Swiss-Prot record, chains A, B:
It is linked to Oculodentodigital dysplasia: A disease characterized by a typical facial appearance and variable involvement of the eyes, dentition, and fingers. Characteristic facial features include a narrow, pinched nose with hypoplastic alae nasi, prominent columella and thin anteverted nares together with a narrow nasal bridge, and prominent epicanthic folds giving the impression of hypertelorism. The teeth are usually small and carious. Typical eye findings include microphthalmia and microcornea. Oculodentodigital dysplasia, autosomal recessive: A disease characterized by a typical facial appearance and variable involvement of the eyes, dentition, and fingers. Characteristic facial features include a narrow, pinched nose with hypoplastic alae nasi, prominent columella and thin anteverted nares together with a narrow nasal bridge, and prominent epicanthic folds giving the impression of hypertelorism. The teeth are usually small and carious. Typical eye findings include microphthalmia and microcornea. This is Gap junction alpha-1 protein. A connexon is composed of a hexamer of connexins. Interacts (via C-terminus) with TJP1. Interacts (via C-terminus) with SRC (via SH3 domain). Interacts (not ubiquitinated) with UBQLN4 (via UBA domain). Interacts with SGSM3 and CNST. Interacts with RIC1/CIP150. Interacts with CSNK1D. Interacts with NOV. Interacts with TMEM65. Interacts with ANK3/ANKG and PKP2. Residues 13-43 are extracellular. It comes from Homo sapiens (Human). Expressed at intercalated disks in the heart (at protein level). Expressed in the fetal cochlea. It comes from the Eukaryota. Sumoylated with SUMO1, SUMO2 and SUMO3, which may regulate the level of functional Cx43 gap junctions at the plasma membrane. May be desumoylated by SENP1 or SENP2. Acetylated in the developing cortex; leading to delocalization from the cell membrane. Disulfide bonds join C23-C34. Belongs to the connexin family. Alpha-type (group II) subfamily. Gap junction protein that acts as a regulator of bladder capacity. A gap junction consists of a cluster of closely packed pairs of transmembrane channels, the connexons, through which materials of low MW diffuse from one cell to a neighboring cell. May play a critical role in the physiology of hearing by participating in the recycling of potassium to the cochlear endolymph. Negative regulator of bladder functional capacity: acts by enhancing intercellular electrical and chemical transmission, thus sensitizing bladder muscles to cholinergic neural stimuli and causing them to contract. It is found in: Cell membrane; Cell junction, Gap junction; Endoplasmic reticulum.
Length: 55, 55
């Protein structure tokens, strides 16, 4: 179960969060920019949870 | 002078006006949509001025 959850988390999100995201879904126009909320702190806690999972 | 002005007006604008224009200039994002103001009436008057010019 641990290795399955680690593989799914790598496949969906990766192990970082970018501050600027680009969106191409209807019913928006061609391409819009969307800005996340505190991505640095979430990157730090994602790295901590990854380390705990590996241990 | 008449044929020069007709050639310049054909080269810049054409002889119609579309109701939806797409814009790709800085400092906007990737592509935005911009909507004109009464383009049908302006198309009609452009056709009248073209006919008067040719006559």
């Amino acid at each position: 179960f641990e290795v399955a959850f680690l593989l799914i988390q790598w496949y969906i999100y990766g192990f970082s969060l970018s501050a600027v995201y680009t969106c191409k879904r209807d019913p928006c126009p061609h391409q819009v920019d969307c800005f996340l909320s505190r991505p640095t702190e979430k990157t730090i806690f994602i790295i901590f949870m990854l380390v705990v999972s590996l241990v």
